[PDB]
Design a protein around this ligand. Structure first.
Ligand SMILES: [C][C][C][C][C][C][C][C][C][C][C][C][C]C(=O)O=P([O])([O])O[C][C]1O[C](N2[C]=NC3=C2N=[C]N=C3[N])[C]([O])[C]1[O]
Ligand SMILES: [C][C][C][C][C][C][C][C][C][C][C][C][C]C(=O)O=P([O])([O])O[C][C]1O[C](N2[C]=NC3=C2N=[C]N=C3[N])[C]([O])[C]1[O]
Ligand SMILES: [Mg+2]
Ligand SMILES: [Mg+2]
Lengths: 489, 510
């Protein structure tokens, strides 16, 4: 009816790195490899090599819309791939190496990945599933050297190439979730989604990411793209410290103090081990001011634990299906007058819905439940970075949405007049141990329930093809939980 | 083929207020009206009343794409209009009341505004131009009451209507700039542009806007939508303090302390008057932490004066054509170890290009100039909230764009290796006085008019009896504020910048 005079310019993830090279080219990207060695590079160097990776991947037959998979932890080569793949108009498929060999082979075949990039210490896993893969044409070891039948990352790098421009709604990356019944379900993100997501979650009431920040993603780069942290840190031009597979407290403290980390994010399990170590050694982190916890409900003790040491803890919530951030916790200005007990209770809640997200806690008919912090209902979402369905799964798609088009998280929650959400339960019958999923129904079909654990957050308990961490520790199910609520302490 | 699984949800300005009402509904919106009185409301009330304004405007015939104009200062009703008009799929035309009656009549006729909302103290101006208007059907006074032939705002409110979602690329608002040659040129903003603009400019390295902030936009809601501040403040759920037409230092100080203002934004002229007041009285602001200055190059002394009082000063740059923010100043982490003098100089610079902005300082061929902070070139921009032309003007459109699609600002600047831009000069021949444009060429025709530095205003016209020349200009339709301060005579004007260098310190300007 009335067109605007605004330029039709597309949002693109490559713009984050292109800006980082131009304005903050000298800012560092520090990586700790699997061997323990520390690698140092910069945004300018990462930008140069990411351009070389684009030309290199093109030589291997990667075109627009093609899937390029990764199996690796947090380091600079993974960060180069985080930009090169979406930069050339291809799809970054970050796969989880902690899954079963059968799960990984299924998702690589389902996504029809053309090229696989993986860490040197994950070679045995790749050697094991290689015979099962039907689409991967080139196997690339993220290192200087590669064994026979394998291509080395540094050898794979080609001539510098310009980024390919695509409509912002086009695919940039994809990830499969194991937090469902049956087969893993695929979610395909767009440039538009991840750019908007990076902006809205970086605001002051969110992560408050700044150029002055030194960012350490403890969250794996195969968990919803490390919660988009590497993208958002590049956007602001913050220094990045990538810890690799070593997430033990001594290894982290070393990077925390040595590189002057100011902001970090990870799952509760890792933070509990860190807090335990800091308390036992009487050590205080000299620069860390802000800590984000997600993936699972952060215990009240974990927050108070870190506040005691001068570390601000902010909870965040989301799904593979939501990019992932939809909810972030912060204390409102008028609620600062609350007592320390009441404030801790508020901090222990899930948090407030973030900008550009439409959140509701609703019933079976889709009607919002009372905002009294007591009535239970399902968290339902709507927005530009929330999935509208699944890739190559009609049955999973048609049950993912409500009649009025809201995504169903499968999470039972309450909400109050202040707008705070608080995850209470789960509709989907699953177990989340140390940030990773275990299917109850898949265990039963071989009764199993999720039992609270101090360390992991849930542990399976079987009442009488799977890994050792999936094995139940000890030996109409809505009652079995309330009976053994304190079986694992 | 291989699409994303992401929802096709549009970006809409209405979501800012909807979120504000649902999470921060009790947060206050405080307005000082033209009478001096202080009005208090909340985001929940504003949201409820904005819904009623949508229903009311629809009853007045406002459809999707229709233009609704405003002639008013900063208050709750303008904030309600800021959301209701775009929320119903209409276009909010924020008009500048400081422009000449002929200019206001021209821009209202050009935009084909159907409804006009105006402040009560601006009745004489509206009465003076009413006969010249051709499209305005309803005249709404932003007050409880209205004279015969005029509709009261409170009367205009109808039934609570649900917002209408339009494509994000579609128009949400428009504004005309008098910073060109000839008649004003129109720029049409989209929902997409302003939502992205509000997000990017609100980051820590920008305005760092938060729920806990108390925001006072001194920048008028008719200056590129108060620099998009009222939208961004609603987005974060910050308390809003809207000062109205009274921008004198004493009135502002009362709001700064009385409402606990933490963040504010405005033009240099306003901040110089405030600094003068605080230094003269010995009064110190008890809550102000962050001050933003834009529209003109902030003087080094102005920044130093506020930093001395504990107020952080950050420069920002933009145009009506750019929404407006494209550049924001902040000190880089590794530059914090610089001395007070070096840091102050860095703060005096324009700043760094903000996220989702493609900035370059280029020559006449379109090639980037060396990054030595010396080589001069034109600032050229590309991005989602940068205009790709002007409304209903093909000629102005093609002359404002480079072959490769960059927008030409008409600003001469230098840039360095750290990425800092510094506006040094202007290609366009104009004078910016107190944030408002004066056309030198228009003053020339009616012999030579140049911009000369001024302590208070920013630049002031100078023509190369002084009383004769004034009355001739007044008769040609020029206001008292547009008249050149002084007249200097010569013999020959070098035909085809020298005069500006010859009379640099004629008004003792800095
Ligand atoms: C840009 C940067 C930003 C960042 C910050 C924030 C962070 C936070 C986020 C996190 C998210 C997580 C992810 C995940 O986990 O996903 P998945 O795997 O798919 O899963 C989902 C699930 O889980 C759970 N959760 C989560 N989170 C949480 C939980 N719970 C409780 N709480 C919390 N927080 C649920 O269940 C879901 O569903
Ligand atoms: C939302 C958030 C908010 C933030 C804020 C920031 C600040 C920034 C803003 C400012 C901008 C202004 C705009 C304007 O002014 O427009 P116009 O009127 O159109 O004009 C344009 C012109 O002007 C000038 N400038 C501006 N700014 C500046 C300047 N100069 C120098 N410096 C500075 N800063 C130029 O010339 C342009 O062209
Ligand atoms: Mg999931
Ligand atoms: Mg202009």
């Amino acid at each position: 009816a009335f067109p605007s005079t605004m330029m039709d310019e597309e949002l693109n993830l490559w713009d984050f790195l292109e800006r980082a090279a131009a304005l903050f080219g000298r800012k560092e990207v520090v990586s700790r490899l699997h061997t323990g060695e520390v690698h140092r590079t910069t945004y300018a160097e990462v930008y140069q090599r990411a351009r070389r990776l684009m030309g290199g991947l093109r030589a291997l037959g990667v075109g627009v819309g093609d899937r390029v998979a990764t199996l690796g932890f947090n380091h600079f080569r993974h960060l180069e791939a985080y930009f090169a793949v979406p930069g050339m108009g291809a799809v970054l498929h970050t796969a989880n190496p902690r899954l079963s060999p059968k799960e990984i082979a299924y998702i690589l075949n389902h996504a029809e990945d053309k090229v696989l990039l993986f860490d040197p210490n994950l070679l045995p896993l790749v050697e094991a599933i290689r015979g099962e893969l039907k689409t991967v044409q080139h196997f690339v070891v993220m290192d200087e050297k590669a064994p026979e039948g394998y291509l080395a990352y540094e050898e794979a790098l080609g001539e510098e190439a310009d980024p390919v421009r695509v409509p912002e709604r086009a695919a940039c990356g994809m990830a499969y979730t194991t937090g469902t019944t049956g087969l893993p379900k695929g979610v395909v993100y767009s440039h538009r989604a991840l750019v908007l997501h990076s902006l809205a979650a970086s605001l002051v009431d969110g992560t408050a990411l700044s150029e002055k920040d030194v960012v350490l993603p403890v969250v794996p780069m195969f968990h919803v793209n490390a919660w988009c942290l590497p993208y958002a840190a590049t956007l602001v031009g913050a220094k990045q410290v990538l810890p690799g597979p070593r997430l033990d407290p001594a290894s982290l403290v070393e990077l925390f103090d040595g590189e002057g980390v100011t902001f970090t994010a990870g799952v509760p399990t890792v933070w509990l081990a860190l807090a335990d170590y800091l308390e036992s050694t009487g050590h205080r982190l000299k620069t860390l001011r802000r800590l984000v916890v997600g993936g699972s409900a952060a215990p009240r003790s974990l927050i108070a634990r870190f506040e005691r040491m001068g570390v601000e803890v902010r909870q965040g919530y989301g799904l593979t299906e939501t990019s992932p951030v939809v909810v972030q916790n912060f204390v409102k200005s008028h609620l600062e007058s609350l007592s320390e007990e009441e404030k801790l209770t508020l901090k222990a809640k899930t948090g407030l819905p973030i900008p550009l997200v439409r959140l509701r806690v609703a019933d079976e008919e889709g009607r919002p439940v009372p905002k009294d912090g007591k009535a239970l209902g399902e968290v339902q979402l709507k927005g530009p970075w929330i999935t509208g369905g699944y890739y190559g799964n009609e049955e999973a798609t048609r049950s993912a949405l409500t009649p009025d088009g809201f995504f169903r998280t499968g999470d039972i929650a309450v909400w109050d007049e202040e707008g705070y959400v608080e995850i209470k339960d789960r509709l989907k019958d699953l177990i989340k141990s140390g940030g990773e999923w275990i299917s109850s129904v898949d265990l039963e079909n071989a009764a199993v329930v999720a039992i609270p654990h101090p360390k992991w957050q849930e542990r399976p308990l079987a009442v009488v093809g799977f890994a050792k961490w999936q094995l139940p520790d000890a030996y109409l199910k809505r009652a079995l939980r309330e009976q053994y609520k304190n079986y694992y302490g």
